Amino acid sequence: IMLPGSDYNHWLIVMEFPKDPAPSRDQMIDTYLNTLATVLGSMEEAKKNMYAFSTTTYTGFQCTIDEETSEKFKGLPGVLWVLPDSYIDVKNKDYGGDKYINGEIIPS
Amino acid sequence: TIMLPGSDYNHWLIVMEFPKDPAPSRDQMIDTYLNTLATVLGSMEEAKKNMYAFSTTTYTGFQCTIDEETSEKFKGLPGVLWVLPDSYIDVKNKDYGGDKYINGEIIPST
Amino acid sequence: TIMLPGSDYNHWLIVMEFPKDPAPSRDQMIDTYLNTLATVLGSMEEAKKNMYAFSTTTYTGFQCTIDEETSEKFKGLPGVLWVLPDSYIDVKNKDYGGDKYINGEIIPST
Amino acid sequence: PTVVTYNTLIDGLCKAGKLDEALKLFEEMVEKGIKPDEFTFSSVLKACARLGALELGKQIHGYVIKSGFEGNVVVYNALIDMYSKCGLLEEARKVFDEMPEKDVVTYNTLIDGLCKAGKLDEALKLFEEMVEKGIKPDEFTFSSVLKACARLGALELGKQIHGYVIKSGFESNVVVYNALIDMYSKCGLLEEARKVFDEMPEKDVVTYNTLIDGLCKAGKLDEALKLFEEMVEKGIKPDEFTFSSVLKACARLGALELGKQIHGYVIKSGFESNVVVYNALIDMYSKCGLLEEARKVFDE
């Protein structure tokens, strides 16, 4: 069985950042993109496939990758959790978080 | 050596084996215990006198006051599985366990 | 490889067994601790100076500054049950616990 | 229809194994704008742990993080228990290392998972850490740590624990003291295990069992037997494991006459059809030469 939206092609990748001090919001997002760019092989493909993230409620990001790709995140610096994403609103079929279109940051 | 409380070798557990399907009734088993005891002791009066306990539930056998030499005579008799020296179940009360048989009256256990 | 906080093997819990009917008084239990420690250390002055804590309630034992080789000398003495390395019971305050003994003053534990 | 009434339903469905119906309820109260909470996530996770529903566990975990519950003690304790019972102790530890607040239950949960995995060093290091941070171990901590010291031969730590247990007022605690008997026995010190036994005011089956096992592994077979009849004289009823230990004690000796009295006891206590007593009887009789008997035992 499965949470609505958990199709194992959407992944929640939560990272760990230092605390004294914290990196800026832009630094955390940059860390998400570079981390995802590492796994995919290009920054162009990381911006394509990161559809959401947070630097407040949690410090992680959400991306359209398959499951064997998502295993490549494990062991990478800063990667805490590699978890199948799930709908926060099943009606809209939407995964929540601050949205990332392709440079467009519209908060929530 | 080491002896279990109550194992004086003048008390014997004689375990038996009946057909499982269909099992003889509680009263047929009881009957068989006395008959088998009376065959070794020579009469039914000595059987009723010396059978102090039995079971038809948690086991199918009877307990009797006989010496070791007599308990040997049960081995290889029809339906006789085990010939084991009895022992207390409750050491405080010197109770050998099972349903009790006192001269024809049955007092079940717990 | 791993140790409890405060177990540096220079602090020792000596647990003693006492008669039960009646138990001795608190003061007698204490003077058993002093005399026992004095027996190993060679003098009462040494025992009084090296006993830093005891109980006669939660446990019946004393706690003393001795090294490991010395602590072995308690084993086989009458009344000695356990020789165990002492340890902190409050780690932040570096406290071994028990009623404290400071040159004859007793400060009960809280 | 409150959060509490939706949670009472999910919990019942969760305890009955009905994860599909539990999740439908979850998604329904989410749909109706009724927020899940501590009990909801912890209810679902506990079922995931019972059933090994790792994947749902991992998705809930995702859902837990996205809805702001990182660090919540009840939820994260359940996360630890779920990852632990699904075999994933590195993940259990990650959840632990991330919790800003830890209670004795937090530590106990991760200690119990580690001990079941044979990761005994990490459990003792974790116990030390718990003492270092001023969290008071409880009956379950002392018991699990002493059992770990016993399996590890970690005598010196066990003896420090013994001191700590004495000072914290645990002398009368049978669970902890059963653990001390085990620790001394498995560390080669039957005399100290005997001392522990003879000091305990209360003794149950497990304390007789623990000390019998130590005598038998030491080859102190006659001492094991004297103790077994001591147990019977005090009214403590033997169990599956008592019978298996003293029958093998008998099946390691010319103790047939005693094995026969125990066989009678075993029959009268309801233990003849018990699998390990089965084999302990078959074993005892075989080592005593009478091989028909063993066949008689087997042929049930």
From Swiss-Prot, chains B, C:
Keywords from the UniProt entry: Chloroplast, mRNA processing, Plastid, Transit peptide
Residues in coiled coil: none
Keyword Protein biosynthesis: no
Inactivation phenotype: White leaves with green islands, giving a variegated appearance. Mutant plants can grow autotrophically on soil.
Subcellular location: Plastid, Chloroplast
GO MF term list: mRNA binding; protein dimerization activity; protein homodimerization activity
UniProt entry tagged with the keyword Plastid: yes
A GO CC annotation given for this chain: chloroplast envelope
A biological process term (GO) from this entry: cytidine to uridine editing
UniProt family annotation: Belongs to the MORF family.
Function: Involved in organellar RNA editing. Required for the processing of multiple editing sites in plastids.
Subunit comment: Homodimer and heterodimer with MORF2. Interacts with protoporphyrinogen oxidase 1 PPOX1. Heterodimer with MORF5/RIP5. Interacts with PCMP-A2/PMD1. Interacts with ORRM6.
Name used for this protein in its record: Multiple organellar RNA editing factor 9, chloroplastic
Organism whose genome encodes this protein: Arabidopsis thaliana (Mouse-ear cress)
Covered range of the whole protein: 79 to 188 of 232
